Design a binder for these strands. Structure first.
Ligand SMILES: [K+]
Ligand SMILES: [K+]
Ligand SMILES: [K+]
Ligand SMILES: [K+]
Ligand SMILES: [K+]
Ligand SMILES: [K+]
Ligand SMILES: [K+]
Ligand SMILES: [K+]
Ligand SMILES: [K+]
Ligand SMILES: [K+]
Ligand SMILES: [K+]
Ligand SMILES: [K+]
Ligand SMILES: [Mg+2]
Ligand SMILES: [Mg+2]
Ligand SMILES: [Mg+2]
Ligand SMILES: [Mg+2]
Ligand SMILES: [Mg+2]
Ligand SMILES: [Mg+2]
Ligand SMILES: [Mg+2]
Ligand SMILES: [Mg+2]
Ligand SMILES: [Mg+2]
Ligand SMILES: [Mg+2]
Ligand SMILES: [Mg+2]
Ligand SMILES: [Mg+2]
Ligand SMILES: [Mg+2]
Ligand SMILES: [Mg+2]
Ligand SMILES: [Mg+2]
Ligand SMILES: [Mg+2]
Ligand SMILES: [Mg+2]
Ligand SMILES: [Mg+2]
Ligand SMILES: [Mg+2]
Ligand SMILES: [Mg+2]
Ligand SMILES: [Mg+2]
Ligand SMILES: [Mg+2]
Ligand SMILES: [Mg+2]
Ligand SMILES: [Mg+2]
Ligand SMILES: [Mg+2]
Ligand SMILES: [Mg+2]
Ligand SMILES: [Mg+2]
Ligand SMILES: [Mg+2]
Ligand SMILES: [Mg+2]
Ligand SMILES: [Mg+2]
Ligand SMILES: [Mg+2]
Ligand SMILES: [Mg+2]
Ligand SMILES: [Mg+2]
Ligand SMILES: [Mg+2]
Lengths: 79, 200, 79, 86
RNA sequence: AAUUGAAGAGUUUGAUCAUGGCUCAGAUUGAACGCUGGCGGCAGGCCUAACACAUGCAAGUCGAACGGUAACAGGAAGAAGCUUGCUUCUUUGCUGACGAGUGGCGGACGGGUGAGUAAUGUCUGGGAAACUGCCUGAUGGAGGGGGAUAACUACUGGAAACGGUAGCUAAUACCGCAUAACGUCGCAAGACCAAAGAGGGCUCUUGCCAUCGGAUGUGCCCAGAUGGGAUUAGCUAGUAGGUGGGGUAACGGCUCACCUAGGCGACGAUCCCUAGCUGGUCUGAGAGGAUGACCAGCCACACUGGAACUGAGACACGGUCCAGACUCCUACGGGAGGCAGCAGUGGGGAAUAUUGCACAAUGGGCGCAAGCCUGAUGCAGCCAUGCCGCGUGUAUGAAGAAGCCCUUCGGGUUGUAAAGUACUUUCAGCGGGGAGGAAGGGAGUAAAGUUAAUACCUUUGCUCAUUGACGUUACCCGCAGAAGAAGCACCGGCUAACUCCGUGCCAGCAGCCGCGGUAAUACGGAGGGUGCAAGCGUUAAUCGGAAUUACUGGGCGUAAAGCGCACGCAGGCGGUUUGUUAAGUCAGAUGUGAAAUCCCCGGGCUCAACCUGGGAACUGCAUCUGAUACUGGCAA
């Protein structure tokens, strides 16, 4: 189905995640429908570690998109 | 990755003081600044237009001990940046931190200052670090028992200290207040020759 | 409006079908001269209204045969 | 087959083939009787055959042997042809 | 703020100007080779044989669908050496669980490769006649029966692969019946079609069926664009269209019968050759030129040829069937296999890596969940393949030491170079400390919402343990001592850098011109020097310079170039005025132009490379609304 999940970008030992709406069948870093945020797990203090377009997430959840475990946890800790 | 060879020959080949010595005694007493190095040294043929452009580039390099690959990358950066490319290039070389350790007077030479290698209170051991306007550069406490740094400051105290910086005694710190204009630097470097050489 | 093309009937020999030449005037990609180009479409003409030389409005429709996916809208001018 | 689940799929798909072929054959037999009644040219015979066919094509569509559009087509094609007969 | 951007030189001649080719300076690479080689970060690494492949691994999962019980862990009964308290040998699905089996879902994803394909492909922009598992919204349903079958059991055929026979049994397996409308067929009247339980403690959770929506995915159609060849000009019979039947999820010559004789083509059909396409990449001032490896989108293929079956989806890489070419096991009767998954082997080649570790993270399958699976992925190994960073000491130091080398023997130069003397300790080595990548999940407890319930369940808090492959991590502190760490090309001009000795058109050099026949800055060595530097050279290859295919931006009297001359179809071009149209053209708006990349302003790794936020850009395409000078159409 349509899922909201993390695509792993960044560099070796220094992950940076794009938060994407995608058909679940596509590869993690492949075809996606829409980018709705990012998550940096090794962000220095002061820098924004997480941004999420919660309105766009709500649109997609309203059309029956699921959310990965990690994105659900990021949605909690943001708001 | 470093020129570890006899240093006076560079100033001799360039035929000008490149400020590459400590200054325990005079440049004239140390070497023949008039004469180019080697067996065919007292000879001085006509130098080509290419040869002139080369020697100007090799002048600006050999002062700082910046090898060609790294110097080329500065040219590209200077050309990219807005405004006058030749001025941008000198501003980038002046913005380097490893000039500062020497220039503030901690090393007797840049080669010594480079052996010795804090900015905004954080340790930086990179010669190529571009120091920004309003940045405080300073020394550690752990190596203030070295006789090198004592001697080097006494050598530094006879030079004309730079006129967009603020070196201090004791805690041994100074602010990069602004970037230097071309007016600040020596009207001797013909940086248009370097711009032209890389445009070739 | 609804989308239509206009062109000249170059054949009416088929039953309930015509061939319409659409002339377009296009700038040459390299040399800049404006050049005449032609696209021939097989068009449906239920009643066999049109004749060779008529100017016709046509519209895109579902496939009606192997080569026909356009239908006659009006005759602009009879020959 | 190399993989265990592939071996099982080969068995299950063969079982499904036999089951499906039987129902498909049966459905086609009942459709053929309507066309055969039309070919002869008798409306009462054709409406009888059609009334037998109708539940079968509908049920096989529900079970997924055919799509409902295919069931619809068969009923439409034969209803049209039965109406033209007398 | 985001297109600030454009260099020439050598070589024809006795000399000259022009013409014109050849050659060079630059940038680049999936490179290779030679010499050399210290460390790190980040990336990259079969371009050739879509050649053949040994071995391991790359797809399973669910007991909360089902009969069960081969494991082994409990539990209860019934007895033996009897540590008077139980191990042990027995029986028993009773329970945790679980081999095999039925059933469900997955195996169509993820991963590989570029053989085929010059248009059933791709790119851009539109369209109508469609289906769509899992997810999601709404409205209802969810009744009552039946016959089987695997496992299993008995017998039994085969060397094996793999069966045969008979009996027995379960379900969310299968099949009627009932029910039946915002469903299907029908002009209507009517007619017709479904389903499944399971789990926790009547209630909750979850699943099942129908219909209409959403979302996603996929099929289909059209226009323009997307290589070369005319020393390929005609091609086409389901061919082009029509009518009717059939067929498809769906339009359709998709198919068939009949009817009409069409359809395509110099705006290049047909035929031949080459080729995966794109975002982009390299180069370039730009316009172009070259290119499509890595990353991402699309397509195609899976030993070769063909075929379907199952399924929401395949004509299916690790599925089925057949045939073929290979190769292997055999009791000779028969059987078996497909690395263009990852690793690896042989082979080809100038040339391209380990038969590694882990599911901790992200994602994927199954599962209520726990979890299990995952060569995706995260990591590690190998290689200077590239990019970026750092080291190989620093200061002093005339004795201008030797030893060099050159010298008009005065000296000069290497060279402050070395030594000597102060010092320093990055990185490497050795020893101690220490982030971050961990979110979650598991336990009982906390309140509220469901509820007959202060139950179970759900959610959120609450507290206590606990999860890292990388890993002897990044990074930090301490120890010892200059210690363990510099090469490669070049020096006649172009082109930065000159002497001596050896050789004597020889040996040899050479990108181009040229150099070498006894005083060679050109060969070979040396001393000195120049350029680059953990690299440097060489070769290959692309663009540049090359305005040397010239659109931007060239020529044709004599340098290459006006057909021997004309007529003329297609085509290109078109005097002047008014009106009209609005095709070109112009303006505005809207939609689209994936992300990455490039660029700008920022941010993060000590810096950089690298990573990353927002913007700009994507010069295009389409649609709508206007303008009407010019070009085109029409009228006079
Ligand atoms: K199974
Ligand atoms: K020339
Ligand atoms: K696959
Ligand atoms: K290909
Ligand atoms: K056909
Ligand atoms: K037809
Ligand atoms: K291109
Ligand atoms: K094939
Ligand atoms: K399925
Ligand atoms: K995992
Ligand atoms: K021209
Ligand atoms: K006009
Ligand atoms: Mg380097
Ligand atoms: Mg000559
Ligand atoms: Mg089991
Ligand atoms: Mg795939
Ligand atoms: Mg029932
Ligand atoms: Mg069923
Ligand atoms: Mg019924
Ligand atoms: Mg030719
Ligand atoms: Mg020929
Ligand atoms: Mg038809
Ligand atoms: Mg068609
Ligand atoms: Mg090919
Ligand atoms: Mg150019
Ligand atoms: Mg490719
Ligand atoms: Mg191409
Ligand atoms: Mg099917
Ligand atoms: Mg498969
Ligand atoms: Mg395989
Ligand atoms: Mg392999
Ligand atoms: Mg070989
Ligand atoms: Mg496994
Ligand atoms: Mg020279
Ligand atoms: Mg000689
Ligand atoms: Mg070349
Ligand atoms: Mg050109
Ligand atoms: Mg010319
Ligand atoms: Mg002549
Ligand atoms: Mg001539
Ligand atoms: Mg003539
Ligand atoms: Mg004429
Ligand atoms: Mg005119
Ligand atoms: Mg217009
Ligand atoms: Mg983009
Ligand atoms: Mg006009």
């Amino acid at each position: 189905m349509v899922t909201i999940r993390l695509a792993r970008h960044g560099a070796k030992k220094r992950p940076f995640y794009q938060v994407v709406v995608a058909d679940s069948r596509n590869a993690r870093n492949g075809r996606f429908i829409e980018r709705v945020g990012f998550f940096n797990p090794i962000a220095s203090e002061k820098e924004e570690g997480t941004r999420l377009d919660l309105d766009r997430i709500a649109h997609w959840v309203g059309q029956g998109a699921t959310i990965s475990d990690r994105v659900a946890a990021l949605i909690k800790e943001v708001n | 990755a470093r020129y570890l060879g006899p240093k006076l020959k560079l100033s001799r080949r360039e035929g000008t003081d490149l400020f590459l010595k400590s200054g325990v005694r005079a440049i004239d007493t140390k070497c023949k600044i008039e004469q180019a190095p080697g067996q065919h040294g007292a000879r001085k043929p006509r130098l080509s237009d290419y040869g002139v452009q080369l020697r100007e580039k090799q002048k600006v390099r050999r002062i700082y001990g910046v090898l060609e690959r790294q110097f080329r990358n500065y040219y590209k950066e200077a050309a990219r940046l807005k405004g006058n490319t030749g001025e941008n290039l000198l501003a980038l070389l002046e913005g380097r931190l490893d000039n500062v350790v020497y220039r503030m007077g901690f090393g007797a030479t840049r080669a010594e200052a480079r052996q010795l290698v804090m900015v905004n209170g954080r340790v930086v051991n990179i010669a190529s670090y571009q120091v920004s306007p309003n940045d405080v550069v300073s020394i550690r406490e752990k190596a203030k028992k070295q006789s090198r740094v004592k001697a080097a400051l006494e050598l530094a105290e006879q030079r004309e200290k730079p006129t967009w910086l603020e070196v201090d005694a004791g805690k041994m710190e100074g602010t990069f207040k602004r970037k230097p204009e071309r007016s600040d630097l020596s009207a001797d470097i013909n940086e248009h020759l370097i711009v032209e050489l890389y445009s070739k | 409006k609804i989308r239509t093309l206009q062109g000249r009937v170059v054949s009416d020999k088929m039953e309930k079908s015509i061939v319409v030449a659409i002339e377009r005037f296009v700038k040459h990609p390299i040399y800049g001269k404006f050049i005449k180009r032609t696209t021939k479409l097989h068009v449906h003409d239920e009643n066999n209204e049109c004749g060779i030389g008529d100017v016709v409005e046509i519209r895109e429709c579902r496939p009606l045969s192997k080569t026909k996916s356009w239908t006659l809208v009006r005759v602009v001018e009879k020959a | 087959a190399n993989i265990k689940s592939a071996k099982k799929r080969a068995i299950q798909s063969e079982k499904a083939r036999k089951h499906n072929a039987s129902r498909r054959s049966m459905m086609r037999t009942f459709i053929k009787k309507v066309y055969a009644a039309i070919e002869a040219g008798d409306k009462a015979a054709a409406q009888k055959a059609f009334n037998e066919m109708q539940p079968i094509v509908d049920r096989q569509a529900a079970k997924g042997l055919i799509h409902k559009n295919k069931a619809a087509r068969h009923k439409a094609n034969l209803t049209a042809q039965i109406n033209k007969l007398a």
